[PDB]
Amino acid sequence: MDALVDYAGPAATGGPVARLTLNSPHNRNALSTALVSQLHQGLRDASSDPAVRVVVLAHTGGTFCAGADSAYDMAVERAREMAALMRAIVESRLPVIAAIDGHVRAGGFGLVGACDIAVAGPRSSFALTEARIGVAPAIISLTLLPKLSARAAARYYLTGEKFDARRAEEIGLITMAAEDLDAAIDQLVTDVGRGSPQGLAASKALTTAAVLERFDRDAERLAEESARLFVSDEAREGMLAFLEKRSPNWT
Amino acid sequence: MDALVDYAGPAATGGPVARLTLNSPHNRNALSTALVSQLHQGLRDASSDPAVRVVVLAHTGGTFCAGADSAYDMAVERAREMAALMRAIVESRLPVIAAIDGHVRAGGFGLVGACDIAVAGPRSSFALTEARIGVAPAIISLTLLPKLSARAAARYYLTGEKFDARRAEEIGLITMAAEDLDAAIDQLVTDVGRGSPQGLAASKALTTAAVLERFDRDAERLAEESARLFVSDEAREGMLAFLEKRSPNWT
Amino acid sequence: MDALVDYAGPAATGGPVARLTLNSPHNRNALSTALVSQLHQGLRDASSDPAVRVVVLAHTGGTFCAGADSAYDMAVERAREMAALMRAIVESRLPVIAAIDGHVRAGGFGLVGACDIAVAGPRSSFALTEARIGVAPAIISLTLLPKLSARAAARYYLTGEKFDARRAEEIGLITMAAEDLDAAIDQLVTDVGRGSPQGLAASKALTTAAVLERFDRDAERLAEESARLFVSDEAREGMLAFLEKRSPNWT
Numbered sequence A, B, C: 001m002d003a004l005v006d007y008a009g010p011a012a013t014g015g016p017v018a019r020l021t022l023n024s025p026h027n028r029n030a031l032s033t034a035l036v037s038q039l040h041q042g043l044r045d046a047s048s049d050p051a052v053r054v055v056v057l058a059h060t061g062g063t064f065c066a067g068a069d070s071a072y073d074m075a076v077e078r079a080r081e082m083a084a085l086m087r088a089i090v091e092s093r094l095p096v097i098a099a100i101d102g103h104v105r106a107g108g109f110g111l112v113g114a115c116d117i118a119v120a121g122p123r124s125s126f127a128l129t130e131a132r133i134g135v136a137p138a139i140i141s142l143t144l145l146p147k148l149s150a151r152a153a154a155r156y157y158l159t160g161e162k163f164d165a166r167r168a169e170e171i172g173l174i175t176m177a178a179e180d181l182d183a184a185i186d187q188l189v190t191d192v193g194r195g196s197p198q199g200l201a202a203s204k205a206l207t208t209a210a211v212l213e214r215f216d217r218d219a220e221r222l223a224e225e226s227a228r229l230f231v232s233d234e235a236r237e238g239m240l241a242f243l244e245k246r247s248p249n250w251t
Helices: A033-046 A070-091 A110-115 A150-159 A163-173 A181-193 A197-228 A231-244 B033-048 B071-091 B108-114 B151-159 B165-171 B181-193 B197-230 B234-244 C035-048 C070-091 C108-114 C149-157 C165-171 C181-193 C196-231 C235-242
Strands: A005-008 A017-022 A054-059 A063-065 A096-100 A103-105 A116-118 A126-128 B005-008 B017-022 B054-059 B064-065 B096-102 B103-105 B117-120 B123-127 C005-008 C017-022 C056-058 C063-064 C096-100 C103-105 C117-120 C125-127
Touching: A005 A033, A017 A033, A033 A070, A033 A163, A054 A063, A054 A181, A054 C181, A063 A110, A070 A110, A070 A197, A096 A110, A096 A181, A103 A110, A110 C103, A116 A163, A116 A181, A116 B151, A150 A163, A150 C117, A150 C181, A150 C196, A181 B151, A197 B151, A197 B197, A197 B234, A197 C196, A231 C196, B005 B033, B017 B033, B033 B071, B054 B064, B054 B181, B064 B108, B071 B108, B096 B181, B103 B108, B117 B165, B117 B181, B117 C149, B151 B165, B181 C103, B181 C149, B197 C149, B197 C196, B197 C235, C017 C035, C035 C070, C056 C181, C063 C108, C070 C108, C070 C196, C096 C108, C096 C181, C103 C108, C117 C165, C117 C181, C149 C165
Parallel strands: A017 A054, A054 A096, A063 A103, A096 A116, A103 A126, B017 B054, B054 B096, B064 B103, B096 B117, B103 B123, C017 C056, C056 C096, C063 C103, C096 C117, C103 C125
Antiparallel strands: A005 A017, B005 B017, C005 C017
16 A cells, blocks of 8 residues: 555456545644645546546545644645645546545545545544634535535534534435445445446536535635634634643633 | 326315326326426416415326437427426415325426425335436436435435435425325315415515526526437437346446 | 513623523513614623623523514514614624523524524424415525525425424424423533634634625515515404404405
8 A cells, every 4th residue: 555645446446446545644644735736646547547437535544634734824825725625526527435434623524525425434533623722614614514504514613512423424514324334335336336427427517516616706715714813813822722731711 | 087187176176275186107107298288287277266275296106207208409498398397386376295106217306396395105216317327417406406405416316326205305305204195295285275375475485586596597508418418429328228228338 | 680681791600601581571572672672782792791702592481582572664674673683693703592492483583593503492382374374484584594404494484383392403493402401501601612702703704604695685675575465465364363263264
């Protein structure tokens, strides 16, 4: 297996499928510049092969993805880079299926939201704790707000509560909870692979049109907001309190 | 009972209700030119009678509706005709309730989506197999995408899986699953009939405004897409493989 | 406790929370001019105090709120006043949580819809009987249509059926049903209060942007519709039939 993203095509998978595996154990599969570039190239390699009709986005280790790896300039570019990665997944001719069995935090939510189908197993957990450190889930709203129920987005954005796979299915964050992740993915890949390349591309595009319109309207405004919050006084205190394990001064 | 659509008014139903029954057994209640014209006239006859406050859309046989009955010109007009029928149901002063106890495929989904309320019994089944024959659910998206959960539309458009009445209720395709269809319809008709003609028309229009805006933006573009897919190379192979019972060449 | 709205701040609540209690027992907590003015002032007093990070909207008695307390001019202004109260809740820097254990009717639905989070206990009931008296749920659509499932809005607007807390959670009208209301509110207030003032305000605004756009487009048109229906012939007969306990003449 390669690092930081491994590619396995039809000759290794035994089907009309490419598997892209996140494999960066040193930082719990964080969204570094190198990992992001390697995901763009992997998606391109899959689309270029006429034998591929579907992609699986998988991971090694106990965490699926825990988020990001003057200060204003670096923060605004990090946000734009997250939007461009999500947009590449949404624009693809190929259906993309997430295979989750581990923790999901921060920017990781944006990957889960961008996939067409998502399945999670019994080790999985989810929490939106942005407000507790002085910020907000701005950029990831591009794929979360079209898919979560209204009442669930408002609850979990404001409470920061941790929840499981069953709750994630109920609210629209994932497609299905499964005790046997491998068996569920194998069945979904079999059924999607029955579709023609033209039929799958056109059927996907019907479901993504409204999502791409939201990116056109809101991506730049949300990137600027993300950066303003990152360099603020309350964000500095929030992160400092976390690293020292004390409570923040507003409490 | 008349063919291809039967009309029963208040003097036969014993209430402030008209029943329109699909009755074309030779082709499993397919959407022929004649059946479509007779549904338009039935909806007009119901609205014209001041004693009618609600319509039930019912069927004979084991199938509710299984879809459609140079080649480009015929295909584009078939798609526009489907949009106009759905739009007539959505624009009516009258609440329209579907009574389903049988199979639903292709264009049949568009009728179910257009109704204000829908109930399905224990013989019912649903499957979106468009991609498996080289096409997409384009025109029917006008009423499916405003009502299905986001995760469910993406799953079932891409997998082609068959599902039951209970699953259809969970995802927003129908209002309720019922073991006794006749008892559930009788109760719903009693409760809707308590409303005044003006109150029911204004209450319905609040819920249909966003749907009619989508028709204004997207109906023509979707009709042109439907026709392009119908006359394509992959669509020809898809239908030929089905009729011979062999697998299509992309597998 | 004060009438018609009581205010309790951090020194009385023992936390970073203000409680606003509806306390107008003579008319079952109806939306009078005085009660509405006192709610605006209470929301302002909470936002002005830097120690407050969340608001609870509570009630005395067995009813949460049962709705409204020449004729055209009075009706159009009543509708605009309802929209402005809902908009004040939606625009606030503070998360607002409803605590319901009683009946909800008419304009009361608009308060429940405007809150960010809503919890209801075992005495609660809900019914949209507008069509039965010749009118429609026009103004309250501003907060109900963004949060209810499509199939549920269409069903309950047209049937007038009564339903409970469990059903209200299923359809998106509330966040959660609870047997012990006080215990559930205490836990939610604890978790929200962990967030910073800036983080909570920015996280809320992401979820309210689409709602405020709907107010901009539709509030005035909906206020004019409300007033036209109020002074109509069918509305006069509907209310007269109710007060005499007879059936209306359209049945």
